[PDB]
Structure formats: structure tokens, C-alpha cells
Symmetry: C5
Subunit: 320 residues, 5 copies
């Protein structure tokens, strides 16, 4: 009946243990209040009672000087990352560069690396799709654009805006932590767990400096991602403007050709009316004449041609 | 004759009392000047004479170390919240996380929670409507868009802009309070009411820190709301651009088809003029010939077809 | 020959005296240099030689600890405000809330109140006009918009942009003064006129704090005005986008209907050409037949209808 | 062979001397390095070795406590300003307000006044042209706009953007100098030339304060110029939007009228086809009847009218 | 098997040596960790263990107090710059202005000069192309624009956006270094290599001040580049708006002319229908009359002309 957390616990030795714990039991074990683990804010990093609470959207983590906890990890495709890369990164030959540093450094590096890799993967999925859709859409030899490609571009633009917002909030959180030295000092949970021990254990290694360098690295990576996303948005806008110009130019060409054909039709209809005037079954004084028929036909055709040419010249003058 | 406030008073025990009090009487009771309770600024939080004055649009509140007052609460549908949730939140088993803290913490938490819930409700009402309107409007199989849906989208966009402005001003007020530690210290009215008593009453609990954490929580919630609203605005703009492109593409397709039909009509009218030339009641030298009629009809139809095909090819060349 | 100021002087007792004074004489009386009273900057507030120099566009004022001066007040419709409200506000039962404070507080409050009321009046004039113009323009049942209303909207948008710039510069000046405590202290001219006297005269009343609260009040009012103006601009842009979409949709509907009618005309002209082929005065082998005439007429009409239906179906397929 | 500066030297007495000096000789005389006088940055003000180096685009100046130098003044139309106003401003009855102050104050005031006057002149040239072009272009009674006026507007908009950038960089330089008190102190070259002498020479006059006031004056003037330029840009954008709406409305009106005429033509052609069906030279059973001709003509005309009216009503229903 | 760096080493004497070194060997020689030389961030400047690590996109450099290293220099067309200009700049008569300063000053100046020259070259390539493309596109005498030029403009706009982003990140890095004095002090690697020696070696020359001046120079150059790029973007947007207006105006002119021709055709077809009514082979009572034929023809032509004139007048009234 009581709410519970599905907890994946990684020790300092990289051992992984999955279980479920009551919320009050977790609060008692971690020495934290209920309000600390509400996880109400997406992309939030805080330090409460010497414990690091982190949320990156669906990823909720609690870092202790002794262990790491992942909360609500089910039905999120996190199993591969949790049980394949994390043990190796924390307690193996992974790509982490904070192994000699205390456990919290490795934990923060792993979490930030996973989030930055997720953002990079989203961008690397979105970029080729948007690029090829724009290339198809801005093709100058198409009179009209493909509307299914327009729907695809709209969906990809929505996804790109969401990704850009995620990168922005990640950058904001990292920069807020980096700006204040107090937060950087608080992030060093192992240092403050036993200050007397770490007063001599830290043989010239500044934990705050290492944390600052790690956060600066991840902030720079997120800044590069944000720059790429903004460039993609700008390219999308420019491509949309080019598409508008192409459509307007095609419309103008078709309208000019239709206007020329309308001039031809109007001259043809005028001299056709002139001919039909002689086609009505009313007696005239020109039935007996032999050359009048050919004269009328010739002047009719020649006048149609001349009026069409004059109208074309008038159009050329009007369009300048 | 004198102006009055309709006052809803909540004690430390959660008891609710509704009455009306003269403005001067309220100023005397609260130890505040007339200018303090003007409530001229929407979404303003201030501390005057050890009392917290708050306005969130229509919600005007005065928080004292002993009680809370809601002013001008009538004809605003506030009765349900005032008489159902507030007593439970202040003096019961509500979702407030500041119960062990002094009364002002619970009061501020309740007010900020109500305002943030109002903003979230506005956004959760606006988002599905805007999403479905955009989905209907950006449908690529519609030659023209529904204008009633356009009016609905315009109204919802105005509402979304108003909501975004409200979220922005809420964030600005909260961040202005959070930036300066003096304002955070002033917000702890119970601490400064009896400094001698609270010098020993506060057994290791920092009231300023608790206030900072509460305000940071609500600021983060408002930031998430603002991000969602900005994403909705960006999606609206992108959908409008897609609608423009779709309409232009449909116009281009219809114009091309009309131009092809105009080519057909022009060729038909040209060779029809040629035929009508022989339809006039003028004597010629071809009436006695038998094959001339069928020859003229055949060459007329064939020339119409050939000129139409040539004009279509010319259009294809022009459009590239 | 020498330049002069038309000076309206208000004493501490609210007495008003209008006269003209030579520029050098005014400089000597006020203890100020010529460069101080250039009034080159619109919306500028400064403190020179213990005197407050203020300019709000056409309103130039000099506040002394003993009196207030309005300069160049003629031909600006300022007479009503100068001779009706200002005496009552300074030395009566006006709405000013700084009466117990020294004279400069009342003077600054009156000037800022007049300017904020002018801005509010401009906004309250512009808002209904813009709202009704947009409501008329975004009407979905209009095939075309009213261009006179477009000109009115353009003029009102220019006025709104000017008002927004005025509000922005007012906010900038007030915030620049508020940010630095030195400027706030300098604004208390009565305090620094006789520091020895005011060392004991100020019985617990902080003049700098009162000035800060007054300026914060007026800054918040200006911020609300700026938010309203920005919302109006955003609504104008959204209405323009909606108008564009409505016009494009009407164009598409008219173009589709014209294309259908063009299909009908083309089929009619094709089978009309077929009929005219038999209308020419050339001998054929079908004159004696009786049923051939009705057969040709029937097949002509039926083929016109069938070709029109096929073209309509082709259009439906093309538009998807 | 060696590079040289064309130097115009103004003494403290306003005497002007024009000559040419080798670059190394100028470096030796001014006590400055080669890198100091590169003048690589447009709109840059710096203090090197107690000398003020200023560049405003084409205007390069070096201010010393004893003299002023203008460099590369040829072929820039600077002769009038150099030899007419500068001597009077520096050593006469000019409009400068820093005459009792040391020479560098007058020099800086003259240079900043010239630059601000140049910017004001550019804006006062651009504003009437842009205003009249927009007024001509947004005329609602024009079916189409004048394209030569469009080219003029484009050129003026480019010039306005360049002017706005110049004002922005001028404001940035002035504000960067004003923000740091060290730069303001360094700008007082006469004070630091002989600190022992000026320790008693400055009888209560703060040179840093005077420099701050002068720079604040010029910054406020530049801010007013920037506000005017931004307002002009906003007005240009609004006028462009109004032009777009006007063109779309004219297109819609013309398209509706063309559609009505197309309906008329289609009905006329339908009943004309009906008439032509009886015009073919094929024997029928209605030649002998006398009333059939008039009956057919009457029903033809009446049906044309009725079908045209029905199509117009259908268009009215479709357009809503 | 192990990863290696292709290292180009420049000594203090300008001697160049190209070789390849294992990554671990380079880390040991430079006294740096593996994470220091990841080069994960484009356009990043840092100081680690008294060594300057710089990346400008493809250019990776490590500056030591004794030497400079270029890493991964192959297949980047860097050979000319590496083996022609760098030796002369570092140990010759180059344009560097930091020769008397320690080696790191010359190294930083050379690297920043190369990057700023690359950015200037990119801008000087992009600007004429964009300018000529816009001039061709905004030509008012073209009914339609060239779409190949549109594709060229789109590609150049993408390149310009990339260049603007590069300039922005360069400015951000330089300004981040300049803002904090600690980073400026750290950049002086020779000063901190032997602090005891440089305590007396630096005879009044402040290395931090020289570094600040160099970085300020390069920041100002990058700011000028960014201003030029932003002006180019603004000009591109304005040209696109002008192109839109030109296309709409041409469309309106063509549509008006087509509407006038449609009026003519409609009047011609109406009176042609009137004439054809008399052309059908049905007996009437007007065959014997002689003047009826000419009367009908004359009234037909005159009515066509009059109806066309009336329709033109109606169009003129409608367009206002
Ligand atoms: Cl169009
Ligand atoms: Mg006939
Ligand atoms: Mg359009």
C-alpha cells in the first residue's frame, strides 16, 4: 500500500543489487527527508544531508559517499546501461577519468556521461533526418513540395526544440552549480563525510578543483550540443524561407505563362467574334462576293496574331 | 462609506473566520501603513513591519507570525480552496512539507502551491486544445484550413501568452527574493518577532535556509512551467509556418493544373477559330469538295492535340 | 536676447508662482552649472549640487529641499495638472503617501505619478483601439480585409512601439537609480542639505529606505505597463499571422472553385469544337441522315459531362 | 619608404599645425610602442603610457596632456571640422562645457561631440527618407507597390543597420569605460602626468567625477540615438507586414472578381454550346417550326443568367 | 596499436621538428594527465600543470614555457602555415608584437592571429558572394528569381551561420579568460615555471597585463568580425523580405492584367452568344430583312466594348 522505490544499488566495488524499498525506509537509510526525494523538478542536481540528489528527466539517482542508487529504473530501457556499462565504469577499465578520485566523482561522471551521450544520440538521430528532409524540400526543380516531408519536418522540428530545451536546462543546472563555490564544495560528499580523516587523506589533491573541472568538461560538451542544435534550427528557418521564395517564383512563372495564354485566347476570341458575326443566318450584301471570304479569314488570323503580339509587348513593358 | 476588506483569517490552529474590517482598522491591527496594503502590483511579494504582503493577481494575502489573512476573496471562486484545502494544509495531514517549521513557512508554501497549481491547470487546459487545433490545421490533405479553428487557435495563443507572462513575473519575483539574503531573512517573520526567544528556540534549524529551499522549489516548478509554455509557443510558430507552406504548395498545384487546362483551352480555341472561319455564310471555292470537310476536321483536331502537347512540354521545360 | 526659462515654482506650502527667469540667473539661484540644465536626455534623473534634475520627455523639473520648479511648461497642456492637482498633492489631502516625509519625497512622488499616469492613459487609449481593429481584421467570414483598418492598425502599432520605448527608458532610469545605494542617498536632498540638523531630526526614519520603496513602487508599476504593452505587441503579431492564414485559405478556396469551373469550361469547349466541326459550311455525307444530329448533340453533352466529372475526380486525387 | 602619419596637432592654445611624421618618430615622441598605434579596432578607446588613443571609424586621435593629434585625416572631408570648429572648441567660446577642466577633458568632449553629431546627422538623413518611402509603400489605394521605392528602402535599411551597429559599438565602448573606475582614473592624463603637482592643483575638483559625468552624458545621447534607430527598424518591419497584408487583400479581391467573371463565362459557354448544337449543318425536325428559334434563344439567355446567379450564390456560401 | 599524436614541435629558437609520439609518452613528457589532452571541446583554452592547451576546431596546440606543439596537423592544409609563417613569427622579423615577452606570449599571439585570420578569410570569401547573389535576386525588373542563385544563397547562409557560431565561441572563450584575473595569471606559464627567477627577471614588466592586452586585442578583432557577420545576416533577411514584396507585386500586376483580359473575354463571349443565337439553323422572321444583320453586328461590337469599359471602371472602383 505504501509507496516504494525500485532501487538499483551500486557499491564502491561496482556490485549491482536490484530490490524494492519503502519510501520511509529509504528516507531513514539515506538520512533524508521526504521532501528531498520528491523528484518534482526535471534536470535538477542538489546536495541534501551530504547526499547528491540528481534527476535527468526519467533518470533519478542518489549518490552517497559509499554507494549509488538508481530509482524508478523500470520500463525505461535503462537495464542495458545499468547492468553493462555502469559496473565497468565504476569498478573497471571504463573510460572514466576520475578513478583515483573518491566514488562520488566516478558516480557523477558516469551519470553526466550517460545524459550527455543521450543528448548526443538524440541530436545525431535528428540531424541527418532534418538535413535530408530540407534537401528534398529546397530542391529548386520541384513546382510543389512534398507535404508528407513537411509533416516529417514538423515532427523533427518539435523533437529538436525539445532536445534544445533539454540541453538548455542541463547547461543551466551545471552552470548554476559551477558559479557558486559552496555548491562545488558540497558536491564533495566524501570530503565532508569524515572531515577529520580527509584533512590528511587528501595529500595535495583538491576535491573541489576536480569537481569543478569535471563539471566544466560536461558544461562545455553541453554547450557544443546547444550550438549544434541552434545551428540546425537556424538552417531549418533559412530552408523554410528558401522554400517560400521558390514557391512564389514558381507561382509567378506559371501566372506569367497563363497571362500570355490568356492574351492569346482573348485575341482569338475577339477575331472569332468578328468571324461569327458573318456566321449568323441573316442576309447580308457580301454572300455573292468570292474574295470576301478569304479576305475576312486572312485579316481575322493576321489581326489575332498582331493583337497577341501587341499584348505580349504590353506585358513586357508592364513587368519592366 | 469607508473602504473595507473582506478578510478571511486562518489561525495557527487552522480555524477559519470570515468577516469584514475597515481599512484603517486593519492597518492598526497589522501595524502597517495605508501604502503597504494598496496591492497596486500584480504578483508582488514584500515584507513590511514584520508582515508578509503577497499578491498573485486576484489573490491578496497578509501573513503574520500568528495568522494568515486573505483579502477581497469574494466573487473569485476561491471559497472551495479557502474552506476545503487551506485548513487541512495549515493544521492537518496535507501535502505541506513545512509542518515542523513556523506558521509562516506553511502559509507561504500553501499560497505558492495554490498559485503554481493554478498555472499548471491553465497550461494543462491550454496544451491539449492547442495541440489538437494544430494537428487539425497542419493536416496535409486539406486544400484549405478551417477558419473557426484559426479563431480558436488565436484565442488559445492569446491565453498562452498571458499565462507565459504570469509565469515570467512569478519567476521574476521569486528570483528577486532569492538573490538577496536580506529578503530571505526578512521573510522569516517568526524569527524576527521575538529574536530573543528564537535565539534559543531554533535548535540548529536555520529558518533562512528552509525559506531558501522552499522558494527554490517553487522557482524550479515555475521554470518548468515556463519551459513548457515556451515550447508550446515555438510549436505554434512552427505549425503556422508548415500551414503556410502547405497552402502555398496547394496553390501551386492548382495553378499548374489550371495552366495546363488553359493550354488545352487555348489550342482548342485556336483551331476552333480555324473551323469557324469556314462556318461563316460567305461563298468559298471549297463547298463542292467532299473530302475537304473531313480533312479540315481531322487536321483541326490533330493540331489541337499537337499544340496542347507542345505547350505542356514547354511548361515542363519552363518549370525545370 | 538671453535664453530664459518659464518657471513654475511650488513652495513647501504648495503655493504656485509662474514667472520667467534668465538662464544665468536660474543657475546662480540653484547653485548649478549651465551643463546641468541642458536637458539633453529624455527621461533622465540626476542629482547635481544637492538638487534633483528630472526630465520625462516634455516635463523638465528641478527639485530643491525648499521648492520645486517646472521648466518650459507652456504649450504642453500642462496647466491643468500644474494648477489643479500639484498644489493639492504637495500641500493638501491628495493621494500622496509621503506627506510626513520631507518635501522632495512628495515632489518625486508627484512627478513619477504624473508620468506613470500619462503612460497608463496612453496604453488605455491604445488597447481598445488595437483590440477592436484586430477583432475586425481577423474576422474569418471576410474574403478580404479592410485596408483603412490596416492603416489605423499601423498607426496604432507605431504609437504602441513609442509607448513601449518610453516605458522601457523609464524602467531603465528607475532601475539604474535603485541599483546603486549612492544614488538613493543622493536623492535625499533634505538629508544632505543640513546633515547636522537631520542627524537628530530623523528620529528613526530612514530617508534612503523610503526613497527606495517609492522608486520600487514606481518601477513595479512601469514593469506592469511594459508587460501589458509587450502582450499587446505579441497579440498584434499573432493576429497578423492569423490574417495571413485566413487570406491564403480564402485564396485557395477561390482558386479551387475557379479550377473546377475551368475544367467545366474546357470540357464544354472541347465538345463545342466537336460540334462546330459539323457547323462549317462544307459538304459532308451526313446531311441527309435524320438521327445523326440528335446523336451528335447527345454524345456531345454526355461527353462534356463525363469529361468534367473525370477532371473533377483527377483534381480530388491530386489534392489528396 | 617608411610608413608615416599625416598628423594634425592642436596645442593647449588651440593652434593647429599640419605635417607628416614617420611612424617610429611618432612612437618615440609619444612614448608609445608600435602596437599601441595599430588602430586595428574600429570605435576603440584606450589609455597607454598616459596617452589616450581613440578610433571612431575613420577618425584616429591621440590625446596627450599637452596636445591633441589627428592621424590619417586626409581624403575624409575632415578639413572643415579640423580647421573651423576644433580651434574654437578647444581655445575659444565654443559649446564645450569643460573649459576650466584640463585639456584632455576638452579634447575628449570635442571628439565625442563630433562622433555623436555624425551619428545624429546620419539618423536625421535616414529617418525622413525611410518615413516617406514607407508612407508611399503602405498606401492602401495602390494595387501594387513601386519597386524602385523598394530598392531605395532596402538601401536605406542597410544604411540604418550600419548606423545602429555603429551606435551599439559606441555605447559598448563608453559603457565599458564607465563601468570600471580604473579606466576613468586612467583617462585623467593630466592628473597622472604630474601627480605631485595635481595633488595640490586640484582644489576640490575631482577629475574622475568630471570624466564620469562627460562619458555618462555621451552614453545617454548614444542611447537615445539607439532607441530612435531601433524604433525606425521596428516601424520598417511593421510597414513591411502591412504591405504584405495589403498585397494579399488586393490579390484576394481581384481573384474573387475573376472567379465571378469565370462563373459568368462558364454559364455563357454552356448555353452557347447548347445553341451551337442547333447551329451545325445537320438535318433536324425543328427547322420548319417558327417559335422554336425564339424559344431556344430565350431559354438559353435565361438559363445563362440563372446559372450565373446560382454560381454567385454558391460562391457567397463557400466564402461564408 | 597504441594511439599516437603527430607532433610538430617549435623551440624557442623557431626550429621545427615533425615526428610521432605515443599518447602516454606525450603525457609523461608534458607532465599532464590523459584527460587533459582529450581535445573534446572545440575552441577551448585551458591551463593544466603550467601548460596551455588550446583547440580551435582542427587546430590542437600545447604551449610550454620552452616549446610549442601542434597535434594532429596532417590532412588539414596546415603545412604551409606551420613551415612558412610560424618559424618567422616565433624567431624572426614577423608581425608579432610580443617578441621581448617570453615565448608563450609569441605562441599565443601566433595561434590567435592564425585563427582570427582564418575567420577573416572565411568572412571575406562569404561577403562578396552573398552581396552579389542578393543584388541579383533583389533586382526589381525580374518577374521571377533565379532558383540556382537561391540554392547558392542558402549554402552561403549556412556557411555564414557556421562562421558566426565560430566567432561567437571564440569571443566567449576569450572573454571568459579575460574576466577572471586568475586565468590571466595562469596563462603566464614562464612566470610560474620559475617564480623565484622571474621575481627578479621581470624588471617592471607585468606579464599578466601584457597577456590581458593581447587577449583584449584579439577579442576586439573577433567582436568586429561578429558585428560584420551579424550585419550580413540582417542584410540577407532584409533582402529576402524585399524579394517577397517584389514577387507579390509582380503577381498582383499580372493578376490585374489577367482580370482585365478576363473582363474583355467575358463581354466578348456574352455578345458572341447573342450573335450565335442568330447563327443556329432554326427558322426566324428576320432572314428577309437586310439591315438587321448589320444592326446586330454593330450593336454586338458596341455592347462588347461598352460592357468591357464598364467592367474596367468597376475594377478601378473596387481596387480604390
Ligand atoms: Cl499568392
Ligand atoms: Mg452556320
Ligand atoms: Mg504569400
Amino acid at each position: 500500500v505504501a509507496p516504494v522505490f525500485t532501487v538499483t544499488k551500486f557499491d564502491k566495488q561496482g556490485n549491482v543489487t536490484s530490490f524494492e524499498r519503502k519510501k520511509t525506509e529509504l528516507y531513514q537509510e539515506l538520512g533524508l527527508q521526504a521532501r528531498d526525494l520528491r523528484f518534482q523538478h526535471v534536470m535538477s542536481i542538489t546536495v541534501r544531508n551530504n547526499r547528491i540528489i540528481m534527476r535527468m528527466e526519467y533518470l533519478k539517482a542518489v549518490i552517497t559517499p559509499e554507494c549509488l542508487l538508481i530509482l524508478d529504473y523500470r520500463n525505461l530501457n535503462l537495464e542495458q546501461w545499468l547492468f553493462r556499462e555502469l559496473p565497468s565504469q565504476l569498478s573497471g577499465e571504463g573510460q572514466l577519468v576520475t578513478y583515483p578520485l573518491p566514488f562520488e566523482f566516478r558516480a557523477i561522471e558516469a551519470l553526466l556521461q550517460y545524459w550527455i551521450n543521450t543528448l548526443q544520440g538524440k541530436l545525431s538521430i535528428l540531424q541527418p533526418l532534418i538535413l535530408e528532409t530540407l534537401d528534398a524540400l529546397v530542391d529548386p526543380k520541384h513546382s510543389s513540395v512534398d507535404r508528407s516531408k513537411l509533416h516529417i519536418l514538423l515532427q523533427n522540428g518539435k523533437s529538436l526544440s525539445e532536445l534544445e530545451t533539454d540541453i538548455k536546462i542541463f547547461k543551466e543546472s551545471i552552470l548554476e552549480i559551477l558559479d557558486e563555490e559552496e555548491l562545488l564544495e558540497e558536491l564533495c560528499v566524501s570530503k565532508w563525510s569524515d572531515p577529520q580523516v580527509f584533512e590528511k587523506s587528501s595529500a595535495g589533491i583538491d576535491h573541489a578543483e576536480e569537481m569543478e573541472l569535471l563539471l566544466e568538461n560536461y558544461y562545455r560538451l553541453a554547450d557544443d550540443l546547444s550550438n549544434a542544435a541552434r545551428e540546425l534550427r537556424v538552417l531549418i528557418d533559412d530552408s523554410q524561407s528558401i522554400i517560400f521564395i521558390n514557391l512564389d517564383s514558381h507561382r509567378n512563372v506559371m501566372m506569367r505563362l497563363n497571362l500570355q495564354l490568356t492574351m492569346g485566347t482573348f485575341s482569338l476570341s475577339l477575331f472569332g467574334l468578328m468571324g461569327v458575326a458573318f456566321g449568323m443566318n441573316l442576309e447580308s450584301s457580301l454572300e455573292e462576293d468570292h474574295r470576301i471570304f478569304w479576305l475576312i479569314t486572312g485579316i481575322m488570323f493576321m489581326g489575332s496574331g498582331l493583337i497577341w503580339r501587341r499584348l505580349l509587348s504590353f506585358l513586357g513593358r508592364q513587368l519592366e
